[PDB]
């Protein structure tokens with residue numbers, strides 16, 4: 001019977017790009033004989049406007065009833081004066097992650113053929129290409145560790161957050177990184193700050209214990225400050241980067257920015273049952289919303305990760321990936337992927353969804 | 365009477381570049397009539413070899429007896445198998461910082477005229493130039509917060525580090541950033557993760573309280589993951605970046621790497637009495653040590669920050685800065701600042717110290 005998907009398109013460009021992800025999914029549903037039912041729920045800014053909070057009860061219960069969450073983007077100027085902590089992004093994403101135990105965040109980033117000039121890296125570096133998958137631990141560390149809070153008053157008033165990791169937490173995420181390296185270029189670089197943090201000393205030690213199960217995979221360790229530097233110089237020498245919550249937050253965004261093409265990048269945040277939340281790497285771009293300008297490929301590839309990882313539909317996932325590839329190499333680019341002089345060749349969001357869905361239909 | 369400087373040259377290239385910083389200081393001592401006495405102490409790898417630990421008692425007591433510490437670089441392959449936490453870098457630097465309450469870290473980084481091609485940024489971005497001063501809080505946050513440690517065993521064994529900040533700690537570092545912005549381009553960008561961390565919510569709130577004393581300075585806030593991205597795209601729009609310990613560690617290194625010329629970058633770590641520890645931004649480069657290849661400018665500019673900030677000798681500090689400028693614009697570059705084809709023009713470490721010291725003598 002039917003898969004059930006909770007669709008949480010959110011704010012800004014979220015709904016208009018979600019529309020295209022749904023159009024391409026309809027083509028993959030027809031092509032592979034999948035029965036998938038979708039229910040839309042508010043989340044983020046639209047949920048604060050419609051329901052008074054960024055993650056309404058009904059939305060959370062709809063996600064509980066689903067096989068996966070296909071998530072858009074949340075946030076925008078309009079809610080940007082609420083405390084940073086009643087704000088829509090953090091208020092949608094952290095409770096979804098904590099509630100469904102979404103410990104694994106996978107962010108594949110690569111420099112696509114022919115779009116090297118868009119990367120902010122000097123041309124000889126982006127010409128080498130890169131393909132880095134960031135595996136970030138998402139439900140532990142300093143994000144959800146306790147005690148967190150503040151005490152005291154005046155000058156001596158103090159706040160505190162505790163970064164905490166157990167061997168169990170590190171070993172589950174490290175295994176995912178090694179398993180992913182096995183299928184790629186067989187190297188895991190584990191990123192930590194083991195010269196300062198007890199958490200990272202335990203991190204490094206556990207990742208080395210996990211490595212015994214992967215003698216075909218090379219493991220190196222690097223400090224987060226050195227990784228931030230080395231991704232600027234030699235990103236082509238990394239394969240799978242394995243990070244705790246706070247380090248992976250920073251490094252996965254640094255690598256996304258280094259592609260120069262965030263409109264192509266998606267994200268999977270999964271638990272150990274295979275339920276996940278699938279979203280584009282980029283934000284809600286509220287200034288271009290409503291104009292048919294936004295690149296829907298990130299939301300479309302989010303749907304492909306959802307099919308692969310939550311729905312175990314590998315053929316359907318790869319048909320969407322290939323249909324994206326076909327767009328990128330057949331002159332179907334949106335404006336932000338085009339150099340300043342080629343920009344009159346830009347396709348709109350709908351034209352991109354039509355092309356990719358048609359390519360799925362045509363059997364790409 | 366005499367200033368007293370503890371000289372802790374450390375490992376790798378540290379001594380050979382320190383030799384040049386001392387040669388240039390001798391020229392500034394003659395030119396400005398300063399009486400400065402220097403005593404050398406082991407620290408880092410050389411201290412572990414000679415004394416069994418990276419920060420011997422006698423070294424720490426020599427720094428207590430000094431007006432400033434002129435520090436080289438620590439670390440190298442040879443000690444890289446000790447626990448990451450008996451290791452020379454962390455074992456020299458964190459106790460010096462904690463012991464002398466060196467709360468303020470200043471790392472000025474700029475793209476120098478004529479060396480834009482060396483930056484790993486695409487050519488149109490490095491052509492715009494940048495000049496970012498990172499002000500990092502160095503004695504609080506998660507580096508020295510307690511409880512830190514681990515408990516338990518097997519799968520449930522857990523480690524923890526606590527990030528802690530008081531208003532007093534934030535306000536002292538924020539004032540330094542605002543005061544520095546006042547003398548530069550009048551903008552402070554405060555970097556935090558206020559959407560997740562209680563510490564950063566208090567950070568943001570206190571920096572906004574401090575801002576009332578600087579109505580001429582613009583304050584913006586940015587999340588660390590977004591700052592890591594925005595420095596790749598528009599580093600020319602930042603002036604003073606204001607960070608807690610762990611965020612400033614990452615961002616100051618990202619910005620150093622983005623210049624492409626770490627051999628030119630120095631660092632000041634100071635307490636509120638004006639005692640500081642002055643060191644190059646880069647590491648001990650143990651593979652080029654002993655060969656006369658290393659660029660001594662970073663250690664030389666460290667001496668200039670030492671004269672300015674610890675010894676209140678502004679004229680002497682600026683004469684060294686100008687003498688460096690003169691080298692860079694008179695064809696005195698070391699090999700790593702030269703493109704692959706111009707590399708036969710490379711000056712050696714001694715030739716660079718001779719030139720800069722002679723320029724100080726000549727009245728630059």
Ligand SMILES: CC(C)[C@H](C(=O)O)[C@@H](O)C(=O)O
Nearest residue numbers: 089090093094249559560589
């Ligand atoms: C909104 C924020 C809590 C979140 C995080 O830090 O994880 C976001 O930056 C991300 O990367 O998903």
Ligand SMILES: CC(C)[C@H](C(=O)O)[C@@H](O)C(=O)O
Nearest residue numbers: 195196225453454457458613
């Ligand atoms: C060696 C390490 C403890 C240190 C730090 O993290 O501060 C270093 O990375 C630095 O930036 O001075």
Ligand SMILES: [Ca+2]
Nearest residue numbers: 249250253589
């Ligand atoms: Ca992020």
Ligand SMILES: [Ca+2]
Nearest residue numbers: 225613614617
């Ligand atoms: Ca560092």
Ligand SMILES: [Cl-]
Nearest residue numbers: 141142245246
């Ligand atoms: Cl963390």
Ligand SMILES: [Cl-]
Nearest residue numbers: 505506609610
């Ligand atoms: Cl910190």
